């Protein structure tokens, strides 16, 4: 018997504005031996996500940061999760974790070795499912429509654009760098603009689509959303997925949208949470995402930070827009 | 047969509104009308509407133009076979006492109109605002029975109809209005709860007090900060019908902070704007017949806030925006 030392990232201090390296503190803990019905997990790939900026509020200062990871079962006294098997675990930022099967999800069966397991945290996982349902259910695209997506080169945004493309939609993206814009055009976005460098957001959205937009997949909220409303087609739909423009500054209230746009254009605005879709419909969506990736219809890119010690940085840099595609940390 | 000249009075927009409208923004003009040509009719205003939309629509006017709006008018004289002298029409002829029409923009009054119902109802409960309430509640909110419904400006033209249709459809209704008199009126016509949003110590407390289980639909007539407060009270997958936003009409370019993304996402709320004119033809006509039936059955009680005299019309409009009116604001010429 050898002692397993689990390293964990803790919330040393609550976030003020943008998170900093010193808001985090590593702890090391010797784990106990497994009881029957339990497994020992070792992190392979750990996700960092925007929601961690929000969820960190409810944490008691000193607790382990929340999050999902892909982990290998090292030791098992649980027959549902044999040693060597791979699981999705809501175990937070930790190198090793003991579970009784509680928050454990088996990866899609028939998972191809050609596909990196870290895709289970992105395109073929929660962000991909958010994109799938937000676009296909909330916006309800069926072909011919013009779709705008913000944070277009991120984990959710990249999938939205490419699914909208395969559905026969015209797709416009807004992202935060020229490199991101170059990438977006090369994966099928019909138009893409850098939102930081616009002369006028109004004219940028006008140039991208002079006839306006059928669907806005909103990842950023704030004043971007407000400007978008003025350019929605009548009876247009806005899927409120996130509001990242207002996560680092939840204290500073964003100015009101135009009642004129919402009323005159008779717009529909709908917030959604990915977890709303369960059972058969969720499994089918995961199979769809898997198939579209295997068919090269959803290209993927992962923004990989190598090393568990670098996990705080990966999260900070992702919030600031360093990532093209899903931000993932390898142990 | 000797003919006498007709003098038409009109209220013009002297100056575009800046913040709250005032009397000085309006200028009365008197025009001697030409004789009727063949195909034309002379109309005399009976009842003229004042409405919130006029605060926004005014921005498109050229200064010196007649203020826009709908009226119930009588055909005084007619050289148009389609419009008999003595018949009653609705016309979007604006704030004017008399006008000449070639028939183009004239809506014949709803047939089978009973004497016992004041014609001015055609501009409120059995008219545009009643249709707004009808479709806003039944089609946008989509009530089926059992829902808890919140309505702002509850004692106004639209709001009073909303609450009463909701009660006859089997819903629980909560109203917010700006005076104690209005609150007592709301309770009297069947609202389950009603509160004065101006005088309550906390707006959030009053909403939780009125409905602990929260709200299935909010029929929003006011928007602004009031709407922001309501979202925290909404039920999961609740609906907000964006009918109007009167609390911001005076400050469209200086808006207050907007809705909470947390509330909209976390509760998965559905917000929809709508325009009453979306519903036309048979669906619109049936809605009107339904409204009249429910009025005649006593399921929809009405009150009108009547201003006597055309020269009092700008004041009627100003005070309606300021909340003087219980029920539909209307000017009797
Ligand atoms: N409703 C749901 O169930 C659900 C689920 C998952 C995610 N979400 C939401 O979806 C959004 C994207 O999530 P993700 O996981 O795909 O992350 P992501 O897009 O891969 O990463 C976040 C990106 O947002 C952009 N960003 C950061 N600050 C911004 C700001 N000030 N204004 C505009 N853009 C900014 C950055 O890219 P740029 O270079 O383009 O600025 C950054 O790369 C988030 O808002 C998240 O909360 C919602
Ligand atoms: N979408 C459409 O097709 C359509 C059609 C018709 C009407 N509307 C809208 O529906 C709303 C009501 O119309 P209406 O014709 O029935 O007018 P109304 O309610 O009869 O009269 C306006 C009322 O708004 C209230 N109000 C004024 N300022 C306010 C403020 N700052 N905060 C909260 N309430 C305020 C006042 O009542 P209180 O005493 O309660 O404050 C006032 O009596 C308006 O917003 C209008 O634009 C929309
Ligand atoms: C426990 O199931 C959920 C469901 C949805 C959630 C979260 C957790 C968290 C994390 C948390 O618990 O705070 C976030 C951030 N969720 C959002 O979708 C969201 C996104 C943007 C805004 Cl603005 C508000 C909410």
Please sum up the structure shown.
Two copies of one chain form a homodimer. Chain A is an alpha/beta fold and 331 residues long.
Describe this entry's structure for a reader.
Two copies of one chain form a homodimer. Chain A has 331 residues and is α/β, with parallel strands linked by helices. Chain A folds into two domains: 1-122 and 301-331, Quinone Oxidoreductase, Chain A, domain 1 (Alpha-Beta Complex), CATH 3.90.180; 123-300, 3-Layer(aba) Sandwich (Rossmann fold), CATH 3.40.50. Chain A contains nine helices and 15 strands. Chain A has helices at 51-55, 126-139, 155-166, 178-186, 201-208, 222-229, 259-264, 280-294, 311-319, and strands at 5-11, 24-30, 39-47, 69-76, 86-89, 96-99, 104-106, 146-149, 170-175, 191-194, 213-218, 232-240, 268-271, 302-306, 326-330. In chain A, strands 3, 4, 5, 6, 7, 14 and 15 form a seven-stranded mixed β-sheet that branches. In chain A, strands 10-9-8-11-12-13 form a six-stranded parallel β-sheet, sandwiched between helices. In chain A, strands 1-2 form a two-stranded antiparallel ribbon. In chain A, helix 4 (178-186) links the parallel strand 9 and strand 10. In chain A, helix 2 crosses helix 3 (155-166) and helix 2 packs across helix 8. Chain A is globular, with a radius of gyration of 21 Å. Chains A and B meet through helix 7 and strand 13 of A and helix 7 and strand 13 of B. Strand 13 of chain A pairs antiparallel with strand 13 of chain B. The structure holds NADP nicotinamide-adenine-dinucleotide phosphate (2 copies) and indomethacin (IMN). One NADP nicotinamide-adenine-dinucleotide phosphate is lined by residues 49-51, 127, 130, 151, 153-157, 175-177, 180, 219-220, 241-242, 244-245, 272-274, 318-319, 321, 323 of chain A.
């Amino acid at each position: 018997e050898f002692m397993v030392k689990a390293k964990s990232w803790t919330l040393k201090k609550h976030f003020q504005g943008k998170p900093t390296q010193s808001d985090f503190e590593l702890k090391t803990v010797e784990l106990p031996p497994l009881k029957n019905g339990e497994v020992l997990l070792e992190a392979l790939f750990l996700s960092v996500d925007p929601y961690m900026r929000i969820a960190s509020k409810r944490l008691k200062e000193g607790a382990v940061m929340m999050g999902q990871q892909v982990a290998r079962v090292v030791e098992s006294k649980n027959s549902a999760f044999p040693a060597g098997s791979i699981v999705l675990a809501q175990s937070g930022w930790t190198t090793h974790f003991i579970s009784d099967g509680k928050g454990l999800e088996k990866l899609l069966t028939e998972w191809p070795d050609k596909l990196p397991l870290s895709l289970a945290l992105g395109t073929i996982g929660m962000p991909g499912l958010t994109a799938y349902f937000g676009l296909l259910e909330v916006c309800g695209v069926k072909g011919g429509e013009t779709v705008l997506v913000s944070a277009a080169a991120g984990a959710v945004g990249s999938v939205v654009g490419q699914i909208a493309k395969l559905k026969g939609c015209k797709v416009v993206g807004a992202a935060g760098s020229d490199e991101k814009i170059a990438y977006l055009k090369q994966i099928g976005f019909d138009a893409a603009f850098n939102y930081k460098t616009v002369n006028s957001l109004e004219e940028a959205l006008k140039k991208a689509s002079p006839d306006g937009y059928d669907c806005y997949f909103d990842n950023v909220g704030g004043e971007f959303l407000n400007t978008v409303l003025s350019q929605m087609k009548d009876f247009g739909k806005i899927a409120i997925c996130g509001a990242i423009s207002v996560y680092n500054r939840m204290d500073q209230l964003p100015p009101g949208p135009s009642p004129e746009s919402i009323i005159y254009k008779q717009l529909r605005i709908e917030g959604f949470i990915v977890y709303r879709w369960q059972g058969d419909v969720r499994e089918k969506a995961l199979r769809d995402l898997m198939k579209w990736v295997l068919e090269g219809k959803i290209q993927y890119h992962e923004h990989v930070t190598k090393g568990f010690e670098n996990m705080p940085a990966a999260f900070i840099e992702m919030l600031n827009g360093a990532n093209l595609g899903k931000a993932v940390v390898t142990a």
